[PDB]
Amino acid sequence: DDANKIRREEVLVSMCDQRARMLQDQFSVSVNHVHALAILVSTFHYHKNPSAIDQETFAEYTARTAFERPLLSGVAYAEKVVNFEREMFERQHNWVIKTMDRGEPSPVRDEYAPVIFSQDSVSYLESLDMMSGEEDRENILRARETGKAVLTSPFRLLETHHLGVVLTFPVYKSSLPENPTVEERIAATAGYLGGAFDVESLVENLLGQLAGNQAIVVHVYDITNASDPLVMYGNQDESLSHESKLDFGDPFRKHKMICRYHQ
Amino acid sequence: MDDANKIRREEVLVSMCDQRARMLQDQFSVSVNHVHALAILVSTFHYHKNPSAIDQETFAEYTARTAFERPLLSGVAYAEKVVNFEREMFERQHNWVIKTMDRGEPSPVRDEYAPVIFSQDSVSYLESLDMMSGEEDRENILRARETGKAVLTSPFRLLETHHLGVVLTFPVYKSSLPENPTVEERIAATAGYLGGAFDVESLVENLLGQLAGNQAIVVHVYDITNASDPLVMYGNEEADRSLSHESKLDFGDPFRKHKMICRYHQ
Numbered sequence: 001d002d003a004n005k006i007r008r009e010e011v012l013v014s015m016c017d018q019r020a021r022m023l024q025d026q027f028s029v030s031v032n033h034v035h036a037l038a039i040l041v042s043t044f045h046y047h048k049n050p051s052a053i054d055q056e057t058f059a060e061y062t063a064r065t066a067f068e069r070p071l072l073s074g075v076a077y078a079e080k081v082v083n084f085e086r087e088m089f090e091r092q093h094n095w096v097i098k099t100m101d102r103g104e105p106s107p108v109r110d111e112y113a114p115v116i117f118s119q120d121s122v123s124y125l126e127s128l129d130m131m132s133g134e135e136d137r138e139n140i141l142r143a144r145e146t147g148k149a150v151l152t153s154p155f156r157l158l159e160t161h162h163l164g165v166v167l168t169f170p171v172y173k174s175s176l177p178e179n180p181t182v183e184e185r186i187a188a189t190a191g192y193l194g195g196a197f198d199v200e201s202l203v204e205n206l207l208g209q210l211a212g213n214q215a216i217v218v219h220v221y222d223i224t225n226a227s228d229p230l231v232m233y234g235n236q237d238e239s240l241s242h243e244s245k246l247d248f249g250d251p252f253r254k255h256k257m258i259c260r261y262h263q
Numbered sequence: 264m265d266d267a268n269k270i271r272r273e274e275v276l277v278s279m280c281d282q283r284a285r286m287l288q289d290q291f292s293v294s295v296n297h298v299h300a301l302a303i304l305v306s307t308f309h310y311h312k313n314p315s316a317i318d319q320e321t322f323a324e325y326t327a328r329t330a331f332e333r334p335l336l337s338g339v340a341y342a343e344k345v346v347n348f349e350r351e352m353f354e355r356q357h358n359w360v361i362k363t364m365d366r367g368e369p370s371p372v373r374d375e376y377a378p379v380i381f382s383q384d385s386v387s388y389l390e391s392l393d394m395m396s397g398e399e400d401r402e403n404i405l406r407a408r409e410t411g412k413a414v415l416t417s418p419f420r421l422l423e424t425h426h427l428g429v430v431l432t433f434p435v436y437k438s439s440l441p442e443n444p445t446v447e448e449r450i451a452a453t454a455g456y457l458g459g460a461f462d463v464e465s466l467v468e469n470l471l472g473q474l475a476g477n478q479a480i481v482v483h484v485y486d487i488t489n490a491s492d493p494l495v496m497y498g499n500e501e502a503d504r505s506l507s508h509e510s511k512l513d514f515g516d517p518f519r520k521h522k523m524i525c526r527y528h529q
């Protein structure tokens with residue numbers, strides 16, 4: 001103690017706040033660029049007739065703009081397909097809609113969200129029905145009903161098994177009315193532009209290399225349910241902490257960063 | 264009056280100025296990055312795709328719908344490189360003639376031109392104008408293509424609005440650009456130029472005027488690329504001569520340097 005204790009607190013606050021700012025900013029930049037991609041698919045795939053976007057073009061553009069989406073492992077576009085359209089859709093694409101868990105031909109469902117365009121980094125998503133995973137399905141529904149960006153809870157991503165969160169933006173047909181109801185949004189839905197925030201790897205890359213990292217313990221929690229906080233980043237451990245604010249841009253979810261010293 | 268109160272007065276000026284500088288720098292950075300994406304969009308969807316997916320109508324729609332991604336820009340446009348040998352061909356295909364910026368008159372013979380072929384509707388008056396026919400624009404085009412990176416002009420009064428602003432340009436290259444290109448190779452491989460108008464006078468005023476304490480403070484931004492010839496980029500004025508603060512700005516072009524100066528009104 002004691003003047004040194006005060007300085008120690010001031011360092012913790014500064015360190016934590018800066019990390020939180022860095023993470024919030026990189027998230028925001030990624031979300032904004034994903035929004036632009038949703039707009040691109042709408043403009044080029046739906047407003048233009050015939051469509052003037054395809055897998056080759058989507059892959060090239062997304063590869064070349066990967067720098068615009070720093071915390072994302074990849075982006076993809078899933079198209080809305082209702083069951084009566086499935087035969088026609090599968091014949092057009094020359095593949096069958098598959099389940100996420102086993103890659104098996106999808107059983108009949110009322111509707112599906114198969115990935116038709118993908119960044120090569122997530123090429124394994126192609127033809128998978130994004131509604132066949134619960135976190136993804138919930139995201140898709142809330143995206144299309146709200147008309148805005150949505151985030152999942154943290155969960156382990158396909159292929160890598162890295163802990164992350166999925167971001168989804170809805171893409172609508174031009175038949176969407178102005179000031180639409182939710183019912184109108186659903187009817188006008190074309191598909192879903194998604195991005196995978198690979199927190200486990202890419203947030204570790206962001207924060208783990210920073211000076212002072214060995215002196216502090218950093219966690220990011222999804223606190224959407226205050227009684228059931230979910231680890232998004234950091235270890236599973238349950239005196240002096242500091243809470244730094246995070247806002248990842250989906251009002252349905254809440255997050256915070258907590259930092260502590262080791263000793 | 265108080266000496267103690269004066270220290271706090273300076274502390275507040277520093278904080279207010281530094282915050283405004285950060286905001287300006289960050290918003291410009293966001294705009295530069297989204298202009299970079301547009302240059303990639305033109306390369307991928309107009310040049311690489313056979314046939315092109317971008318006509319004027321498509322460019323206008325996409326850029327209108329994404330205007331929010333580019334906060335300090337009044338408009339974006341794409342100018343294609345046209346060498347004189349090709350001019351008659353280009354004009355016949357487009358069904359219009361390349362015009363000068365100063366009078367919208369048919370361009371005289373020049374070695375090359377940079378006519379705008381795609382434009383956000385906000386800068387629709389740029390269509391068919393040779394961007395090499397304005398000196399600030401011409402210098403920007405050359406440095407963009409030679410360096411391969413984003414470039415900014417000195418402050419000048421923009422077309423139509425006459426607002427004081429700066430122009431941002433990214434080069435677009437042909438697929439023939441070699442890896443690790445020389446400058447000579449970059450010039451030979453140039454397709455055109457994706458430009459954006461930073462309307463500093465209107466849009467920086469809009470940004471600053473909404474902030475709490477705006478009436479208490481005077482904010483000026485200077486282009487200090489030439490130390491002995493500072494150029495006003497933003498600002499007018501009745502200001503407190505006894506105290507000022509300088510805040511750092513980095514707008515992303517190593518060829519240019521800038522700073523912000525804030526003072527109290529009184």
Ligand SMILES: C/C(=C\CNc1ncnc2[nH]cnc12)CO
Pocket residue numbers: 074076077078115122125130133136139140156157158166167168169192193194195196
């Ligand atoms: C294409 C869409 C979402 C992307 N979701 C995923 N993207 C990448 N990896 C994953 N693993 C589990 N889900 C994902 C549409 O919302």
Ligand SMILES: C/C(=C\CNc1ncnc2[nH]cnc12)CO
Pocket residue numbers: 338339340341342379386389394397400403404420421422430431432433456457458459460
């Ligand atoms: C299209 C290009 C630049 C855009 N330049 C301008 N864009 C809009 N207003 C202006 N006034 C003078 N120059 C401009 C290419 O570098």
